[PDB]
Enzyme design. Structure first.
Site, PDB file in Angstrom:
ATOM      1  N   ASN A   1     -38.276  96.076 -58.036  1.00 43.39           N
ATOM      2  CA  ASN A   1     -38.224  94.646 -58.310  1.00 43.39           C
ATOM      3  C   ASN A   1     -38.305  93.873 -56.997  1.00 43.39           C
ATOM      4  O   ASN A   1     -37.323  93.761 -56.270  1.00 43.39           O
ATOM      5  CB  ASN A   1     -36.946  94.322 -59.076  1.00 43.39           C
ATOM      6  CG  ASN A   1     -36.819  92.849 -59.406  1.00 43.39           C
ATOM      7  OD1 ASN A   1     -37.782  92.093 -59.294  1.00 43.39           O
ATOM      8  ND2 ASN A   1     -35.641  92.440 -59.841  1.00 43.39           N
TER       9      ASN A   1
ATOM     10  N   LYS B   1     -38.432  90.814 -56.711  1.00 43.88           N
ATOM     11  CA  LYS B   1     -37.791  89.504 -56.917  1.00 43.88           C
ATOM     12  C   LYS B   1     -38.733  88.412 -56.395  1.00 43.88           C
ATOM     13  O   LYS B   1     -39.945  88.506 -56.585  1.00 43.88           O
ATOM     14  CB  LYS B   1     -36.400  89.451 -56.280  1.00 43.88           C
ATOM     15  CG  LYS B   1     -35.541  90.669 -56.672  1.00 43.88           C
ATOM     16  CD  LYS B   1     -34.096  90.492 -56.226  1.00 43.88           C
ATOM     17  CE  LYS B   1     -33.251  91.685 -56.667  1.00 43.88           C
ATOM     18  NZ  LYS B   1     -31.812  91.437 -56.341  1.00 43.88           N
TER      19      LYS B   1
ATOM     20  N   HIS C   1     -32.637  89.988 -66.198  1.00 44.95           N
ATOM     21  CA  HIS C   1     -32.070  90.229 -64.884  1.00 44.95           C
ATOM     22  C   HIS C   1     -30.891  89.300 -64.623  1.00 44.95           C
ATOM     23  O   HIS C   1     -30.930  88.120 -64.992  1.00 44.95           O
ATOM     24  CB  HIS C   1     -33.126  90.035 -63.802  1.00 44.95           C
ATOM     25  CG  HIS C   1     -32.719  90.603 -62.484  1.00 44.95           C
ATOM     26  ND1 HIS C   1     -31.927  89.918 -61.587  1.00 44.95           N
ATOM     27  CD2 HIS C   1     -32.935  91.826 -61.945  1.00 44.95           C
ATOM     28  CE1 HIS C   1     -31.696  90.688 -60.542  1.00 44.95           C
ATOM     29  NE2 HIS C   1     -32.297  91.852 -60.736  1.00 44.95           N
TER      30      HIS C   1
ATOM     31  N   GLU D   1     -29.998  87.670 -62.144  1.00 42.81           N
ATOM     32  CA  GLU D   1     -30.332  86.414 -61.477  1.00 42.81           C
ATOM     33  C   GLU D   1     -30.828  85.376 -62.484  1.00 42.81           C
ATOM     34  O   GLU D   1     -30.544  84.181 -62.359  1.00 42.81           O
ATOM     35  CB  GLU D   1     -31.354  86.676 -60.377  1.00 42.81           C
ATOM     36  CG  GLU D   1     -30.701  87.406 -59.220  1.00 42.81           C
ATOM     37  CD  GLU D   1     -31.628  88.280 -58.422  1.00 42.81           C
ATOM     38  OE1 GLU D   1     -32.866  88.188 -58.572  1.00 42.81           O
ATOM     39  OE2 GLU D   1     -31.107  89.087 -57.613  1.00 42.81           O
TER      40      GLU D   1
ATOM     41  N   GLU E   1     -26.683  96.577 -64.221  1.00 41.06           N
ATOM     42  CA  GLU E   1     -26.430  95.890 -62.956  1.00 41.06           C
ATOM     43  C   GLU E   1     -24.937  95.673 -62.771  1.00 41.06           C
ATOM     44  O   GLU E   1     -24.318  95.000 -63.579  1.00 41.06           O
ATOM     45  CB  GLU E   1     -27.134  94.543 -62.922  1.00 41.06           C
ATOM     46  CG  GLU E   1     -28.636  94.589 -63.056  1.00 41.06           C
ATOM     47  CD  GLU E   1     -29.177  93.190 -62.962  1.00 41.06           C
ATOM     48  OE1 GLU E   1     -29.293  92.685 -61.821  1.00 41.06           O
ATOM     49  OE2 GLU E   1     -29.351  92.544 -64.004  1.00 41.06           O
TER      50      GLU E   1
ATOM     51  N   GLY F   1     -22.076  90.170 -54.137  1.00 41.87           N
ATOM     52  CA  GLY F   1     -21.530  88.963 -53.546  1.00 41.87           C
ATOM     53  C   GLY F   1     -20.061  88.715 -53.821  1.00 41.87           C
ATOM     54  O   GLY F   1     -19.586  87.586 -53.771  1.00 41.87           O
TER      55      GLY F   1
ATOM     56  N   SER G   1     -27.057  98.469 -55.832  1.00 48.11           N
ATOM     57  CA  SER G   1     -27.688  98.682 -54.545  1.00 48.11           C
ATOM     58  C   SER G   1     -28.161 100.123 -54.403  1.00 48.11           C
ATOM     59  O   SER G   1     -27.361 101.064 -54.392  1.00 48.11           O
ATOM     60  CB  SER G   1     -26.729  98.324 -53.416  1.00 48.11           C
ATOM     61  OG  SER G   1     -27.333  98.597 -52.165  1.00 48.11           O
TER      62      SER G   1
END
Ligand code: NA
Length: 250
Positions: A8, A10, A93, A95, A165, A171, A211
């Site tokens: 991906n 992104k 996703h 995001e 995910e 974060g 990750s």
């Protein structure tokens, strides 16, 4: 199940000239083992990837809308993608769920529309820090998968890949372990087995979408319920091939 690695990109790279350089690098990569490789890129770069990327791999969109066409300024639709010969899209996703506020009803409608129009999908799910810390990760992920399940048309599970995910580790100041990846992919497989049956659970690829880097891909790949990866930043680098080649440990 065949090991599956999606890269991906992104919203990257910045320029089509960089996209073409990345494709040149990927085209020379020596793949080991057996693995299905898909590369997802920004809409504007999809034509050049479809033209130039090695044909033993497949190109993916990063999103599609719910309708074939119409008064939806800014949206790209399944027929547009398909008209280039592109067969894949990512849906849901983190995001897009969390930043662009795509809810489960919107995503379920995308999954149904994409599949009934001959697309294959990488459908993403995953829990946030509150639910992880409350010990409710499996309940949250189950609710997401239960919204997805009725959207899958009869006979279309061969065209569904699910990515987990660990949003709780993005974060937040917390990191995921290899065991966390295995546990959550197994949770998803068990949800599938309970809701739609062992036959489907045994054939659906479930990916780890946290990750993934050259330094952890082999140990992750060896996990029994991890069938591959939805790779982030490493998909823009030579290390992507290490991750593709981790299939030999699975
Ligand atoms: Na595995």
């Amino acid at each position: 199940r065949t090991f599956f690695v999606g890269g991906n990109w992104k919203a990257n790279p910045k320029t089509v000239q960089e996209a073409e350089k990345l494709v040149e690098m990927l085209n020379g990569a020596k793949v080991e083992g057996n693995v299905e490789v898909v590369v997802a890129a920004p809409f504007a770069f999809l034509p050049t990837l479809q033209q130039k990327l090695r044909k033993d791999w497949k190109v993916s969109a990063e999103n599609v809308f719910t309708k074939p066409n119409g008064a939806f300024t800014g949206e790209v639709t399944v027929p547009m993608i398909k008209s280039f010969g592109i067969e894949w899209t990512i849906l849901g996703h983190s995001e897009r769920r969390d930043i662009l506020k795509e809810d489960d009803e919107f995503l379920a409608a995308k999954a149904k529309f994409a599949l009934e129009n001959g697309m294959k999908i990488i459908y993403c799910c995953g829990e946030h820090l509150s639910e992880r810390e409350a010990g409710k990760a499996s309940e949250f992920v189950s609710a997401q998968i239960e919204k997805m399940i009725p959207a899958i048309p009869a006979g279309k599970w061969d065209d569904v890949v699910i990515a987990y995910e660990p949003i709780w580790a993005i974060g937040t100041g917390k990191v995921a372990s290899t065991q966390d990846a295995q546990e959550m992919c197994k949770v998803i497989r068990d949800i599938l087995a309970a809701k739609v049956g062992a036959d489907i659970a045994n054939k659906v690829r479930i990916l780890y979408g946290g990750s993934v880097k050259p330094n952890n891909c082999n140990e992750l790949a060896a996990c029994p319920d991890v069938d591959g990866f939805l790779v982030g930043g490493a998909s823009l680098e030579a290390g992507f091939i290490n991750i593709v080649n981790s299939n030999v440990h699975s």
